[PDB]
Amino acid sequence: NTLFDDIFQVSEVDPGRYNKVCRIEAASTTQDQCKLTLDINVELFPVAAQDSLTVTIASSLNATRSWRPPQAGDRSLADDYDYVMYGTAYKFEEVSKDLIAVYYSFGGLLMRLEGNYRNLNNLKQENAYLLIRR
């Protein structure tokens, strides 16, 4: 099931003098304080300044043992979506009241999620799939 669902706005792009990784800032289009931090992988998903993301953090895909390689005619909830990430949550923090920011990574791949409405469905997780549009 989905645990997080909104549409974001790329603020600015910088390389970091890496090769396939550029850091992306991401404010929102529906709440003027959610500021996602994005270390995008540039080659599977070309980003640019002021694109139209849709950053959704679900957890599972409707025992489920491990990663079978994707076979023919399967049912993934992430079938429609392309740049799909996987990681854990490791550190929460606190900002101004009624805002709960997290730290969040994907194999050395930093996030930062200021916001409010993730204090009733989200927590320090282990298995979350990032179902990005575009």
Partner: protein, 147 residues
């Protein structure tokens, strides 16, 4: 040793397991310090991204379970990071699963917080990877180096 009772002690007291931490200060002198560690920079950073065939070969050249390094029945790996018509992997993921496929079960992973000598101003701006962190024993942030 031209007896057997010195095979008892030199296998169990002059062994390299028991001389890691030297008793002079507490500064250890043991480890790969010349080539496998300036190649640690170009392995686990995000400019070193790996496919399934790279992630698969880069552990079986390490474990070698025929000598005996598995503990549950066999070897296992993790799910891939990126889900896509090619699943990519990460050099952060590399150091994890070799640090996972040898430790026996009924044993939690280890948790480090430490530093490096890289000082993130050389990774550009604002990206914090001087700092290491092992959530369940996995290089979950930062690039391993000399320290």
């Amino acid at each position: 040793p031209q007896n057997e009772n010195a095979r008892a002690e030199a296998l169990n007291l002059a062994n390299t397991d028991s001389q890691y931490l030297t008793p002079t200060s507490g500064s250890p002198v043991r480890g790969l310090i010349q080539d496998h560690i300036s190649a640690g920079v170009w392995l686990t950073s995000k400019d070193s991204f790996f496919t399934r065939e790279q992630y698969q070969q880069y552990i079986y050249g390490c474990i070698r379970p025929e000598d005996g390094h598995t503990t549950r029945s066999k070897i296992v790996t993790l799910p891939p990071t990126i889900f896509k018509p090619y699943p990519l992997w990460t050099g952060k993921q590399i150091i994890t699963t070799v640090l996972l496929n040898v430790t026996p079960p009924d044993m939690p992973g280890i948790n480090l917080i430490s530093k490096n000598k890289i000082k993130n101003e050389y990774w550009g701006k604002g990206s914090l990877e001087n700092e290491v962190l092992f959530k369940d024993g996995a290089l979950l942030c930062g690039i391993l180096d000399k320290s």
